[PDB]
C-alpha cells in the first residue's frame, strides 16, 4: 500500500504529462464529444449546427455568449422545463456562482457526471505536491471546510454552491480512505447544518490532534483567517473541553457529539499548552506554535484574496503560502504545477479534459484595472484563440464549452499567459472583470456601487446637502473586513444632519448591493458592516491636484469609484472627519427573490 501509493502518484503525474503534451488533441476530443452527445439539443439545433461536431464549424456557427444571453434557456430549466434545452443529459442541479446577474447569484447548470471530472482535478493535487514536500501521507491536514446555504428552484432542482454539493456527494461523504485526504475535521463535522457548531467542532478536533498536523488551510484565505479569529474568541472554552475531555453542552448536533467523541479525550497537559500559547499578547506565528509540524498554509491568495497575505504571514510566521487549483461553479479549470512558488508567481495549468477552452484577447488600460476593452486590430470575428494557440505574455478573457450545456460562455476571468507545460499554457490570474470591491466571495462592480450610492444619497435631499465626490476601498484591517466609502458632502442647509441618517446611508448602500454581499453580512458573517468616512471639504480636489501634476487634463479627470493604491487610501484617511457604520444587517434570504 505504501508502494501502491507511489504507483498512484506516478500515474497521476504521467497523466499530467500526457494531457499537457496532447492538449489540442484532447481539446478537440472533448468538443467532439460535447457536440456529438448534445447534437439534438434545442440550443444547438436552433443555431443551425445540424449535428456537426468539427471545431471549425463550431467556432464559425455558434455565438460567444454572456450569462445574460443564455438566461432564457437557464431560467426555463430552473422553472422545470425538463426537455433537452441545453443538454442531452438531465441537469442534476444548479451551481450558484458568486458572480451575479441582477443582484442575484448566477445559476450554472451541471450534470451528475461532472462530479467525476471534479474529482479528477482534485486527484492531481497531492501527486503534484508530494513531488515538493514528501511524506505528507504520514500526517493529517487541518482544513476548515464548510457547507453553505442552499435552495430549490421553482422547477424543483437544487441550487447550491459547488463545494456544498461536492461535500455532500458520494465522492466526498463516502470517499475511499485516502491518506492524502486524511483531515482532522470529521465529515459530520463539516456536513453540520449549523455553522457555529461546525466551526467549533472543527477547531476542537484540530487542537485535539495538533501534533499530527503537517499542513493547514481552507479554500480561501478569508475563511482560514476567520477560523484563527474564532480560536482567538473561543480558546478558553475549547481548552476547557480538551481539559475535561467533554464537549461544550452548547453543541446540540448528535452527529457532531458522536464524531467529536471519537477524538476528544481528557488532556489537561494539552489544555495547559493551548492556553499558554493563546494567552500570549502576540499571536505572531501562533500557527507554528500550536501546530508546530505545519509545513505550509493551503489557501488561495491569488486574485482578490491576495490582500490577506500579510495577515497570513503574521499568524504563520512566514510559512509558505500554497495556491493549489483554479475553478468556478461552471467548471473546474486547472492545477498549480509549482505549489511552492511565491504568490505573485502562481500560474495555473488548465487541464484540457475539463471542458473546451477558448480565449478572447483583451487589453486593459493599466495593470491595476478590472475593466476590459477590445484591442484595435482584433466582437465580429468571434473566431477566438484555442488553448494551445495563446501567446506568451498576452492577456485573454476565458471562454468555455462544458458538458452540461454551456457553449462558448464567457467566464469573465482575465488571464495572462505566463508559460507552458509541454504544449499546455499556464495562466497567471489577473481578475474577474469589473470587480472593484471584495472581502470574501462577494464581488461588487462599479455599476452596483454607483447605483447603491445613488440610493443612499436620497437621505441627504431633505437636508439640502449632496455628495460631491466619493471613492471606496476594501478595508481588511479587521476580521472580517468591510467596504469603506469616502464621502465629501456639499452642505447648503441650516439643519445639521443627525448621525442617524449617515447610518441610514450605510444601511441603504448595503441593501442595494447584491445577494452575495448581503448573505455574507447576514449568514456567513464573512463581511463586517459597511463604513462611510466623511472627508474634509476639498479632499477630492487635492487628489485631482496629484493627477494634474502628473500629466492629467482637468476637463477629463474623473474621481475613481474605487482605489486600492495604499498611499492614496492613506491620504484620504488623513482627511477623515467622522465615520459611520451600518447599524444592522441588510436583508438576505436563500434563493432568488422571485422564489
Ligand atoms: O475546491 C477548491 N479547493 C479545494 C481543494 C482541496 C479540497 N480538499 C478535498 C477535495 C476533494 C476531496 Cl475527495 N478530498 N479533499 C477541497 C477544496 C476550489 C479552488 C478554487 C476555486 C473553487 C471554486 F469554489 F471557486 F470553485 C474551489
Ligand atoms: N485560485 C484562484 N485564484 C484567484 N481567483 C480564483 C481562483 N479560483 C477561483 N477564483 C475566482 O472565483 C471564480 C469562481 O467563483 P464561483 O463561480 O463563485 O465559484 C473564478 O472564476 C475566479 O474569478
UniProtKB/Swiss-Prot annotation:
Signal peptide bounds: none
pH-related activity note: Optimum pH is 9.0. No activity at or below pH 7.5.
Organs and tissues of expression: Expressed in cotyledons, stipules, true leaves, hypocotyls, and all parts of the roots. Not detected in flowers.
CC terms in the record's Gene Ontology section: cytoplasm
Keywords associated with the record: Ligase
One of the GO biological process terms: unidimensional cell growth
Induction: By auxin. Not regulated by light.
Known EC number: 6.3.2.-
Gene Ontology molecular function terms on file: indole-3-acetic acid amido synthetase activity
Superkingdom in the source lineage: Eukaryota
Pfam families associated with the record: GH3, GH3_C, GH3_M
First-level EC class: ligase
Misc note: The gain-of-function mutant dfl1-D (T-DNA tagging) has a short hypocotyl under blue, red and far-red light, but not in darkness, shows an exaggerated dwarf phenotype in the adult plant caused by the inhibition of cell elongation in shoots, and inhibition of the lateral root growth without any reduction of primary root length.
Entry function: Catalyzes the synthesis of indole-3-acetic acid (IAA)-amino acid conjugates, providing a mechanism for the plant to cope with the presence of excess auxin. Strongly reactive with Glu, Gln, Trp, Asp, Ala, Leu, Phe, Gly, Tyr, Met, Ile and Val. Little or no product formation with His, Ser, Thr, Arg, Lys, or Cys. Also active on pyruvic and butyric acid analogs of IAA, PAA and the synthetic auxin naphthaleneacetic acid (NAA). The two chlorinated synthetic auxin herbicides 2,4-D and 3,6-dichloro-o-anisic acid (dicamba) cannot be used as substrates. Involved in auxin signal transduction.
Family label: Belongs to the IAA-amido conjugating enzyme family.
PANTHER family the record matches: GH3 DOMAIN-CONTAINING PROTEIN
Annotated protein name in UniProt: Indole-3-acetic acid-amido synthetase GH3.6
Taxonomic lineage of the native organism: Eukaryota, Viridiplantae, Streptophyta, Embryophyta, Tracheophyta
